[PDB]
Write an enzyme that holds these catalytic residues in place. Structure first.
Site, PDB file in Angstrom:
ATOM      1  N   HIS A   1      79.897  76.301  12.542  1.00 36.53           N
ATOM      2  CA  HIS A   1      78.837  75.326  12.912  1.00 36.53           C
ATOM      3  C   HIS A   1      78.073  75.679  14.045  1.00 36.53           C
ATOM      4  CE1 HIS A   1      80.260  71.829  10.419  1.00 36.53           C
ATOM      5  NE2 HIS A   1      81.449  72.464  10.669  1.00 36.53           N
TER       6      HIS A   1
ATOM      7  N   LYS B   1      70.158  63.375  21.579  1.00 37.08           N
ATOM      8  CA  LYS B   1      70.920  64.290  21.013  1.00 37.08           C
ATOM      9  C   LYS B   1      71.800  64.574  22.297  1.00 37.08           C
ATOM     10  CE  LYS B   1      67.762  67.636  19.995  1.00 37.08           C
ATOM     11  NZ  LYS B   1      67.888  67.094  18.461  1.00 37.08           N
ATOM     12  N   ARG B   2      72.920  65.424  22.446  1.00 32.56           N
ATOM     13  CA  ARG B   2      73.668  65.689  23.683  1.00 32.56           C
ATOM     14  C   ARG B   2      72.529  66.776  24.415  1.00 32.56           C
ATOM     15  NH1 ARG B   2      79.164  64.925  23.892  1.00 32.56           N
ATOM     16  NH2 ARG B   2      79.179  65.977  25.746  1.00 32.56           N
TER      17      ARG B   2
ATOM     18  N   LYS C   1      69.127  73.035  23.716  1.00 28.53           N
ATOM     19  CA  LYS C   1      68.232  71.965  23.110  1.00 28.53           C
ATOM     20  C   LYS C   1      66.913  71.905  23.815  1.00 28.53           C
ATOM     21  CE  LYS C   1      72.326  69.549  21.226  1.00 28.53           C
ATOM     22  NZ  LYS C   1      72.063  69.589  19.705  1.00 28.53           N
TER      23      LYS C   1
ATOM     24  N   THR D   1      71.108  67.462  12.676  1.00 25.64           N
ATOM     25  CA  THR D   1      71.204  66.496  11.467  1.00 25.64           C
ATOM     26  C   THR D   1      70.271  65.264  12.217  1.00 25.64           C
ATOM     27  OG1 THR D   1      73.235  65.535  12.671  1.00 25.64           O
ATOM     28  CG2 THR D   1      73.591  67.081  10.575  1.00 25.64           C
TER      29      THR D   1
ATOM     30  N   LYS E   1      67.670  62.489  10.039  1.00 21.75           N
ATOM     31  CA  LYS E   1      67.682  60.893  10.457  1.00 21.75           C
ATOM     32  C   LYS E   1      66.335  60.458  10.529  1.00 21.75           C
ATOM     33  CE  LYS E   1      72.301  61.499  12.142  1.00 21.75           C
ATOM     34  NZ  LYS E   1      72.800  61.126  13.579  1.00 21.75           N
TER      35      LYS E   1
HETATM   36  C1  LIG Z   1      80.959  73.862  17.198  1.00 27.57           C
HETATM   37  O1  LIG Z   1      80.505  72.444  17.159  1.00 27.57           O
HETATM   38  P1  LIG Z   1      79.084  72.284  17.333  1.00 27.57           P
HETATM   39  O2  LIG Z   1      78.808  70.911  17.640  1.00 27.57           O
HETATM   40  N1  LIG Z   1      78.140  72.682  16.209  1.00 27.57           N
HETATM   41  C2  LIG Z   1      77.029  71.743  15.667  1.00 27.57           C
HETATM   42  O3  LIG Z   1      77.510  71.544  14.287  1.00 27.57           O
HETATM   43  C3  LIG Z   1      76.394  70.579  13.864  1.00 27.57           C
HETATM   44  C4  LIG Z   1      76.891  70.298  12.430  1.00 27.57           C
HETATM   45  O4  LIG Z   1      77.022  71.240  11.457  1.00 27.57           O
HETATM   46  C5  LIG Z   1      75.097  71.337  13.687  1.00 27.57           C
HETATM   47  O5  LIG Z   1      74.149  70.383  13.068  1.00 27.57           O
HETATM   48  C6  LIG Z   1      74.321  71.596  14.997  1.00 27.57           C
HETATM   49  O6  LIG Z   1      73.215  72.283  14.966  1.00 27.57           O
HETATM   50  C7  LIG Z   1      75.527  72.553  15.557  1.00 27.57           C
HETATM   51  O7  LIG Z   1      75.180  72.856  17.158  1.00 27.57           O
HETATM   52  O8  LIG Z   1      78.710  73.040  18.788  1.00 27.57           O
HETATM   53  C8  LIG Z   1      77.627  73.064  19.353  1.00 27.57           C
HETATM   54  C1  LIG Z   2      73.102  62.444  14.270  1.00 29.68           C
HETATM   55  C2  LIG Z   2      73.742  62.437  15.843  1.00 29.68           C
HETATM   56  C3  LIG Z   2      73.903  63.515  16.539  1.00 29.68           C
HETATM   57  C4  LIG Z   2      73.329  64.794  16.155  1.00 29.68           C
HETATM   58  O1  LIG Z   2      72.036  64.954  16.514  1.00 29.68           O
HETATM   59  P1  LIG Z   2      71.288  66.448  16.479  1.00 29.68           P
HETATM   60  O2  LIG Z   2      69.858  66.195  17.086  1.00 29.68           O
HETATM   61  O3  LIG Z   2      71.394  67.063  15.438  1.00 29.68           O
HETATM   62  O4  LIG Z   2      72.198  67.022  17.770  1.00 29.68           O
HETATM   63  C5  LIG Z   2      74.364  63.406  17.807  1.00 29.68           C
HETATM   64  N1  LIG Z   2      74.681  62.316  18.301  1.00 29.68           N
HETATM   65  C6  LIG Z   2      74.866  60.993  17.545  1.00 29.68           C
HETATM   66  C7  LIG Z   2      75.259  59.661  17.886  1.00 29.68           C
HETATM   67  C8  LIG Z   2      74.224  61.158  16.346  1.00 29.68           C
HETATM   68  O5  LIG Z   2      74.100  59.831  15.477  1.00 29.68           O
END
Ligand SMILES: COP(=O)(N[C@@H]1O[C@H](CO)[C@@H](O)[C@H](O)[C@H]1O)OC
Ligand SMILES: *Cc1c(COP(=O)(O)O)cnc(C)c1O
Ligand SMILES: COP(=O)(N[C@@H]1O[C@H](CO)[C@@H](O)[C@H](O)[C@H]1O)OC
Ligand SMILES: *Cc1c(COP(=O)(O)O)cnc(C)c1O
Lengths: 810, 810
Positions: free
Chosen positions: A351, A542-543, A548, A650, A654
């Site tokens: 990932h 997002k986090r 990011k 992801t 959304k």
């Molecule tokens: C080791 O786990 P992660 O949370 N990796 C995350 O997995 C998600 C699910 O496939 C991806 O959509 C994100 O782009 C990626 O950053 O590390 C930061």
């Molecule tokens: C979908 C989701 C994420 C992932 O968001 P990204 O912008 O792909 O990092 C993170 N946190 C929550 C609560 C989500 O619903």
């Protein structure tokens, strides 16, 4: 009320009402004179839960009868969110319950807000596992999610004085109506000890024992009567444990701390012993459960034909050595046969490419905690390197690079290398990411076994991410093309023939405005904050991470503010910029970024000259339940990671499904989203991966940009001088220092193109009709991003099973 | 099957069966193909629980409507045992459930054996509280039991190599169907901090906060539709608690350890901080709950008219200073008014005269943990001593003796003195005990306030201790005099007119033989041990203590063994001596006594010459569920504590009600039992309290007895020489040393009379008819020992409320 929410039949509503009152009386032991909204929520949850039981019991015995190949998805995270509405949607009980509760004088919507989020995840990886479970059930796969039942999930975030404060997520306080403890299936897990070599095989003795008690949660498929299981393990101390007396009983907490709390570092590697214990705990208990189920349906040659184990990143990587241990040490299979079974059974999903996220465990830790596993890992490494040596004779550096054992200060075991060696398939999560894996990080492995490498682009479930959170949009869509798209998202492409339909264009725009009004109201009710509903909703949730680039967003916001102050009476498209996300507790820079965002808001939101033309809000405690509220209300989705850093993303998917346009870099799945919708319908900007590499070869010098861009210079000088922190003039010194001297993510390099791209966004927004037509083109081509498509690919290309749409009996 | 078990009506059995299947399906989520006996137990428990709800809800709102004076019984222990059968008995559902389960192909008796005992007590004191709750509900009193929900109750005892081994009593492992968490009524409890003196009153600030979450368990009265509540508090850490991150969350266990485990020292004082925290925890949460309920029905002058607080020993003694704190510091009442309310509200029950059982807390502990309470205690002491000084001018030693503050090595607070000063009533638990309190321990207090001292002889509930555990006996009794005696035990006196009835005599003897056969079988099935059902069952079950003198019993057993070996071919009445009980984990001598008992068995049970004429068995893990099995099977009840040491005893009453004759000293309630049945119908022996005092004045010299009694000398020489421990010749040296040089309980002094008395027991046993007639005279006069009589006296003489037999509506 709305079509897609099912039928509200007379006999159904009548039945629901009586069962609701029955649970309120017998289950909650209360009567409507002292019952509070929380009591009502539980009465409703138990009522809906009852409708899952029949299906759950028959689904499971159905698998016992047919004995299909079983899929085991191992993950340390399952970011489930709330379960009530999702269950009603999948069982087609939403309108009936809505009517039944209405007739009882209760607003179902406010009862739903009472449920706590099951926040057993950090973000993307954890939520992906959750969407996957929903899709596997919807596609009729005999799948099981296995993880840990954390007593405390991801911390609740509070903002005090503009700073992040963390507090325990005691999500089980009021009880969990959805789970069913199965204490009868408790299993032992071993730790520490030593290895003894007898005449016939090695033995792992003198171990410490911790019990694994499973709790099962039902996972309903979308209206197909299939209900799969998510089994989460909880740590329990044995009763002979530590057996002055009082202290021995209190010390039981030492063993039970294994399932106490989720590490909140968004999965960036922290080599802590407790984390390793969690990883082995889930792996050891799950494998015993898998073998038991296999033997109760001894030639293990058929094991791979009845079992598929998917490792969600390297967190459950110990499954490889553990499976070998069981087959060799306990079942007495020869090594080569055991290895063949192991490889054919396991598959690994990577990932991320970020180095500080890769697991590299110190050998001394494994040596003490899992002596036998370390020996098995060494043997795996020896045999693997012997194969490499035979394929690339004389290439000594390749042997060093591919070894599972890393040399240096302290010896470490590269878990990613272990997963590749022991899996028959390895996949990335977006086309560009999977390619990067083969070209860089895992190049050596790809050259040795090209057949193992695949791509499985991520996806999201359209049930939770469309029907559940945006009923208004789901309804106007269904009115035109039916409801079949909910389980076959590719049908959304039929909407392209409506891009010129004035009626549809009006409805799409109406739904968005309604969502924005609803969210604008929410902001004032539970958190108190005014926002102009007629402004462009610019959202980045997002986090918080440097990769990011929330910092790039910040520079744009300050640029907009400086331009307004420059020409106050000049017209500009109004915007309310929203940024939300949690920072890992020990990630200093991430916490400083949150402070900077609130600091900018403090200045911008109170500047009389700005008025309601620009607002900056930091969305507190971003989580699944909040995402369900803010995403449907967004106009602009910010996906601006440095090219090559976001494996997939992801959240981006959304936003696309919910009517927001996207501004982003050609990173992760953004590339495929733009390809599906058409580049003219996406706001792409910045360096591509190739550009980032050219810059690194040359050497990134932030000073160059500072010297050539006047507007950028002004922002830095404002930050440095204390413009956004009058009382603490040097508060943001660390941020400036980083941007200017050690920015691994090249924020300045994409600034100019980003600002220009944002101007084009504003231009299209003041032409409502054309903005909405582009939105329709995005929604219409978001079908590929359904996790149903993703899971169907895993099933056919990795697990060797055919998905089914056929519904089961009730 | 039997009359007293209720009716099994067609529509009742049919309803029970369907609700049973409903719970098995929807509640347990299983079907009869995978269900285990445990699943069946829970299905039945939930079914019976359903029948309590209606009554529970209406009983409570009934009290809210009528606003009766409420009784609060505070105790750190509630030894409840199993709840399933008791509930069925009180709701008259036993035969119906028996039939319903029978029709489903299940044996209810084996399902009942699956339930875990709620062992939240050590022995007598904890069980008394349990019998009291049953009687208060049966007498229609608006009573509430308040305590702590220990995660771990009294340890399970295992015997390994003849030694006691302890293991955690994880009684909540499989869940507790009887309790209902009320997280919504959680209250804060404060610890540590400091006291600030402002213009208007003192303030307790900078405290640590621990939350108290209540769990309610229903307490059904006997067929009167009344269902009262037992509320137990569980400790929970607040969410801002300790707010690196991970450690902060793990440290939550520090605060939650308060309700983790019950101290197992049979209440002998151990001045540990955790114990003090438990005591304040229960007191603080309970008082807030009491005041809330009082305000929701502000002149506190009426507080004593609506509230009665009964302190079960000094464990909840902090209720006095805590009530003062709330009234003075929070409600702003003047001291004198607050004190008047406090005294009229509180009453104290003393349960022992043994010095090492009295609570004397170090001032430095209170000073650090409860600063404000220490100040209030000092003020109470000052004002109390001022009253003593005025009543006994110049008597300086009296002032020292009566002070709540004890001087010496370390200052301590005598909690018993605090309770007397702050209560309007103080009672002992048996006539002789209450007299001893006034003549010795509390003489000074009695002289100052004679009106406060009362007696309330203990009792046991005839529901659990007759109907539930001995249905056969309850049935033959009901056949003659009806079922009214179950709630009016005094009616058993009608049985005296049957002492010459050959039919009744035969039935009584038949019931006993059946119970003995059933128990003899049990011994072989779950623990494997042969026993002659035709021998006299000599039983001594209670906690292991030097004052209870299990050692005296041992000397008699060895005497019997030596006599047989002396004259092998001489006839002797066969006996199987059973001794059971747990020893406090750190009580060395108690553990050595258990070892001695098993050691004697090892020799006696395997001596060919003895045959089946004498057997010695140590009953492992004695607890409430085991008492329900062994007591109905007993012929002889051993109650042989040194005169003046057993405050009352309650096991003695259980044996009397179940058809066993008693051999004992004139101690505790034994005196009243002999008075009720007649001395000729009791086997009384040994020194009376007056004799023990004469011996102490003279000086007890064990050597004197050793030199004058040849048989006693032989036993000591056998113990010392290693006769009962060949491998470890000096294993019992500590025991011999104690008996010979520092026996506080004068075992040797009662040896000769004890052995002679035992000979008379054997003589009567070989005359079946006369033995049974004496048994009938005992059962017939056991009525006074019903806890219904005890509670009626507390109600009328202390609480100021009238008991009721009137049944409530369904
Ligand atoms: C080791 O786990 P992660 O949370 N990796 C995350 O997995 C998600 C699910 O496939 C991806 O959509 C994100 O782009 C990626 O950053 O590390 C930061
Ligand atoms: C979908 C989701 C994420 C992932 O968001 P990204 O912008 O792909 O990092 C993170 N946190 C929550 C609560 C989500 O619903
Ligand atoms: C401080 O509590 P105890 O358990 N006291 C016991 O209380 C019981 C209940 O009233 C009595 O029947 C016992 O005779 C007495 O010993 O201390 C040993
Ligand atoms: C009744 C009871 C007691 C009290 O017995 P005594 O002989 O009075 O000390 C102790 N333990 C259990 C389990 C009981 O049922």
């Amino acid at each position: 009320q709305i079509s897609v929410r099912g039928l509200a039949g007379v006999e159904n509503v009548t039945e629901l009402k009586k069962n609701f009152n029955r649970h309120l009386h017998f289950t909650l032991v209360k009567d409507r004179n002292v019952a509070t909204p929380r009591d009502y929520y539980f009465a409703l949850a138990h009522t809906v839960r009852d409708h899952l039981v029949g299906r759950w019991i028959r689904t499971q015995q159905h698998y016992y009868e047919k004995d299909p190949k079983r899929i085991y998805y191992l993950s340390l995270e399952f970011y489930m969110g709330r379960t009530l509405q999702n269950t009603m949607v999948n069982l087609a009980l939403e309108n009936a319950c809505d009517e039944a509760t209405y007739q009882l004088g209760l607003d179902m919507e406010e009862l739903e807000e009472i449920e706590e989020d099951a926040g057993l995840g950090n973000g993307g990886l954890g939520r992906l596992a959750a969407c996957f479970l929903d899709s596997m059930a919807t596609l009729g796969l005999a799948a099981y999610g296995y993880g840990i039942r954390y007593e405390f999930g991801i911390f609740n975030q509070k903002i005090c004085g503009g700073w992040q404060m963390e507090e325990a997520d005691d999500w089980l306080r009021y009880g969990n109506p959805w789970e069913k403890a199965r204490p009868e299936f408790t299993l032992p897990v071993h730790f520490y000890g030593r290895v003894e070599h007898t005449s016939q095989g090695a033995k792992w003795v003198d171990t410490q024992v911790v019990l694994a008690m499973p709790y099962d949660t039902p996972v309903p498929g979308y209206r197909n009567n299939v209900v799969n299981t998510m089994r989460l393990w909880s740590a329990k101390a044995p009763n002979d444990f530590n057996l002055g007396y009082i202290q021995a009983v209190l010390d039981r907490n030492l063993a039970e701390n294994i399932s106490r709390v989720l590490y909140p570092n968004d999965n960036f590697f922290e080599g802590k012993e407790l984390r390793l214990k969690q990883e082995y705990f889930v792996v050891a208990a799950t494998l015993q459960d898998i073998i038991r189920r296999f033997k109760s349906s001894t030639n293990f040659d058929a094991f791979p034909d009845k079992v598929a184990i998917q490792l969600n990143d390297t967190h459950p990587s110990l499954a490889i050595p553990e499976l070998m241990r069981v087959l060799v040490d306990l079942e007495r299979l020869d090594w080569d046969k055991a290895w063949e079974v192991t490889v054919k059974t396991c598959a690994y999903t990577n990932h991320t490419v970020l180095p500080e996220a890769l697991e590299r465990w110190p050998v001394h830790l494994l040596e003490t905690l899992l002596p036998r596993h370390l020996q098995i890992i060494y043997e795996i490494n020896q045999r693997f390197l012997n194969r490499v040596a035979a394929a690339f004779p004389g290439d000594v550096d390749r042997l060093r690079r591919m070894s599972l054992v890393e040399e240096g200060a302290v010896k470490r075991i590269n878990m990613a290398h272990l997963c590749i060696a022991g899996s028959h398939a390895v996949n990335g999560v977006a086309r560009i990411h999977s390619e990067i894996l083969k070209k860089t990080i895992f190049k050596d492995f790809y050259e040795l076994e090209p057949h193992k490498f695949q791509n499985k682009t991520n996806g999201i479930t359209p049930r939770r991410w469309l029907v559940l959170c945006n009923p208004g949009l789901a309804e106007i869509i269904a009115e035109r093309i039916g409801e079949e798209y909910i389980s076959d998202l590719d049908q959304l492409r039929k909407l392209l023939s409506y891009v010129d339909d004035e009626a549809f264009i009006r409805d799409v725009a109406k739904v968005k405005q309604e969502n924005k009004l609803k969210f604008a109201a929410y902001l004032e009710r539970e958190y108190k904050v005014h926002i102009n509903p007629n402004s462009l909703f610019d959202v980045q949730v997002k986090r918080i991470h440097e990769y990011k680039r929330q910092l790039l967003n910040c520079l744009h916001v300050i640029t907009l503010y400086n331009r307004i102050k420059k020409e106050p009476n000049k017209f500009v498209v109004p915007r309310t910029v929203m940024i939300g996300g949690k920072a890992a507790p020990g990630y200093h820079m991430a916490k400083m970024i949150i402070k900077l965002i609130t600091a900018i808001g403090d200045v911008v939101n109170h500047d009389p000259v700005v008025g309601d033309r620009l607002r900056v809000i930091f969305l507190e405690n971003y989580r699944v339940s909040l995402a369900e509220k803010v995403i449907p209300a967004a106009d602009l989705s910010e996906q601006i990671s440095t090219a090559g850093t976001e494996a997939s993303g992801t959240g981006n998917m959304k936003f696309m499904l919910n009517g927001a346009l996207t501004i982003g870099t050609m990173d992760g799945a953004n590339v495929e989203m733009a390809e599906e919708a058409g580049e003219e319908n996406f706001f792409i900007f910045g360096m591509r991966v190739e550009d980032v590499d050219r810059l690194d070869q040359r050497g990134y010098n932030a000073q160059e940009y500072y010297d050539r861009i006047p507007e950028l210079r002004q922002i830095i000088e404002q930050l440095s001088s204390g413009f956004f922190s009058p009382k603490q003039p040097d508060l943001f010194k660390d941020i400036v220092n980083m941007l200017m001297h050690h920015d691994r993510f090249k924020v300045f390099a994409d600034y100019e193109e980003y600002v220009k791209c944002q101007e084009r966004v504003s231009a299209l927004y003041k032409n409502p009709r054309e903005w909405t037509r582009m939105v329709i083109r995005n929604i219409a081509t978001s079908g590929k991003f359904s996790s149903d498509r993703t899971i169907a690919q895993y099933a056919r290309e990795i697990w060797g099973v055919e998905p089914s749409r056929q519904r089961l009996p009730a």
